[PDB]
């Protein structure tokens, strides 16, 4: 009735993606930077997607 | 479909193999007859060669009918032929290879999807037995299934300079094969036995057994040798000819040793990288069937 | 040149480990503020001589 | 028997089978494709056996 | 060289040196020493180096063949020099 | 596949990831069929990144 299986599995695979993108070493500090921001970016997808 | 009688496929006149020379269609053996040596400081001894890879390279889902006969035929002894692997069709052999497949391996060589009229075949018992081995060509290439291009040679050394003492001894002296010829005459020699419909060769020597076997390989040892001849000179390091009174005697240098050379030159066929690991793959295959 | 050779082989930055002892990255980088969120720090407030 | 190359001797024969490819198979075109840039410089790899 | 100025300097040169690696629990492992001195020789910036930065472990190993088969199927190289 | 070349080196680069992952939900047939295609892809982002 609230529930949406298919949102809810987006839900773990963005979550699974981000604590991905969060255990991604980098070397440049700009992609230390787009590093964290493509994880406000996977966010917004899943808001999108729900 | 051909019935193959009790000696090998061989036995039929329509089968046999003959290098044109001296205005004739001569045997291979009246050519190696001219063939003559001068052995060297060095020495060729065999080592065992490695078992060939149980592994079996996928026939890939091919619509069309491979030309094999006209693919192996080139990829050893072809003039013109290079990158012979990229292609890689003689995977295409592995279909013969299952019991009751719906393939068949025509007498023109081709290796049609499904059985034709009018195309008359080799006995698909024979046939698998032949693909058995065969189909490994398909893993000439890849890096885990690549045979020796260097040790393997001395073999091919033995089996067509070798005395019958020096292959009894394993060991000979590097030799130095020369013989009277006409101008061209390793090209010649190259298309004539380029032209052989060596999958009767290949058929009977996969599938005859036991004294049929043994009979093939005696009826047949200087057609294996001439195959071995043309392959040689694509890799002997050199070719010179000698002036002898009015006469011109060919000499390749040398017997048994893989030069590894891939530059072209005039005298002979080249071995390309490709051709190398092919060959040296086939020889792999038909050294393994010529002892057992 | 030299000091900085010397400090910056040691790490750009630094974390604390359970036992709070400062561990350096031992690798010279920029630092960006999206650190300043995340267990590192700069090395060069460490105060570690 | 096979039959005598043609070349090995000298007569003329004024009859031959000349190979010559369809229209299907062409040659010498010029070819098409997507060649794709890469997307920082500083990011490529000069040096690596 | 005074073994004295020699000592202190050794040791300064030798306390400098940290190279990349991640401790783990396994008795089996060593360290691939080789490389990952030669990526700190070449301040990560070769392949093999950045392969050193962003996976330490790589370096650890039980087999010590596949210690090298690991970088060059990462890499996809077919040798390194 | 309408082949992608990417180097996966910043972490924006799981966009493509996604891209994967997002086919493979609204299209699990069609995905079927390029799903080699998309391998050769997600070798380069392991080999790169895991």
Redesign the interface.
Known sequence: TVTNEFASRFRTIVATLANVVNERAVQDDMQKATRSCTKQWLRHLETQFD | MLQQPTGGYTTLEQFAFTIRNDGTNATPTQFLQLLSYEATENELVKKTIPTPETHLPSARNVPGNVYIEDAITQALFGISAQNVNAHGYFSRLSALALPNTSARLGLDGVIYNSETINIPFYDPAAVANFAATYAKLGNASTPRYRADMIDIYAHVGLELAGTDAERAAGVMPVKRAKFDSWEGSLISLSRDVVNWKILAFLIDLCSLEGEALRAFKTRNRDVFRMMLFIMSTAVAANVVNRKVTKRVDRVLEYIGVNSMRTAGRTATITYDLSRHEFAAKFLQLTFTRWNA | PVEYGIFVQRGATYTINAAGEFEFSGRNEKWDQALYLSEHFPALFSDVP | QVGIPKLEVDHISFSNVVSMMTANIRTGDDMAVERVNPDDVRAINIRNA | IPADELIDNLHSWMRSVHLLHVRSEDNTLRYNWMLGVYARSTNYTTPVGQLVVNAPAILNYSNPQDAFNSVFVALGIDYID | LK?I?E?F????S??V??EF?LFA?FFPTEFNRIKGDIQNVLLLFF????
């Open positions: 082949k070349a180097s080196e910043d972490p924006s799981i966009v990831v996604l992952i939900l080999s790169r990144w895991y």
